[PDB]
Amino acid sequence: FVNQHLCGSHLVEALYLVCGERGFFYTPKT
Amino acid sequence: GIVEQCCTSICSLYQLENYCN
């Protein structure tokens, strides 16, 4: 069934979109 | 943190927004 989880590059893209010009910090586990 | 909340589980918009600068 359709996946609602945001992981990896998809999570980074999500932050890019929602945070907009505010920006954000991110660190992967891998 | 964001991984457990949004990747392992499912997160809402305001949870995600709270990780922004």
Query: Strand, helix or coil at B20?
Result: strand
CA–CA gap between residue B2 and residue A10 (Å, rounded) = 12
What resolution does the deposited structure have, in angstroms?
Answer: 1.6
Whole domain around residue A9: which residue ranges? 1-30
CB–CB contacts below 8 A, A to B: 40
The residue among B18, B15, B7 whose CA lies nearest residue A29 is: B7
Based on the structure, what is the number of domains in chain A? Answer: 1
Asked if residues B19 and A21 have their Cβ atoms less than 8 Å apart, the reply is no
What phi, psi does A15 have (nearest 5°)?
-65, -40
The DSSP string of A1-30 is -------THHHHHHHHHHHGGG-B------
Asked if residues B18 and A19 have their Cβ atoms less than 8 Å apart, the reply is no
How far is Cα of residue A20 from the mean position of the Cα atoms in its chain? 12
Resolved by: X-ray
Is B4 in CB contact (< 8 Å) with chain A? no
Q: How far is CA A11 from CA A29, B16, B20, in A?
A: 13, 9, 12
Shortest distance, CA B3 to any CA of chain A (angstroms): 7
- Residue with tokens 């995600």, as numbered in its chain: B16
